[PDB]
């Protein structure tokens, strides 16, 4: 049978956060991928 092979490890991870003196809360930017890990 014929099986297509798509490599793993979709996209990169980018951290979006304000300054240290502002707040410690962060917002993670997943690039070119659907919500998965969360």
């Amino acid at each position: 049978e014929i099986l297509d092979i798509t490599p793993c490890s979709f996209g990169g991870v980018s951290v979006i956060t304000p300054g240290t003196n502002t707040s410690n809360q962060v917002a993670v930017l997943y690039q070119d991928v659907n919500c998965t890990e969360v």
Binding site: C8, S9, G12
Partner: protein, 48 residues
């Protein structure tokens, strides 16, 4: 005005899906880290 923004991951591109290969890559220092920041600065300048 703007050039196509391309962020190349040197961890995946150089060593595909391999930790042992990446272990040898860490012996090269910042070659991965520095080049990834060089292309990062390009994508930032294209936005500027």
């Amino acid at each position: 005005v703007s050039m196509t923004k391309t962020s190349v991951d040197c961890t995946m591109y150089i060593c595909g899906d391999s930790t042992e290969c990446s272990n040898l890559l860490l012996q090269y220092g910042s070659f991965c880290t520095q080049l990834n920041r060089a292309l990062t600065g390009i994508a930032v300048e294209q936005d500027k």
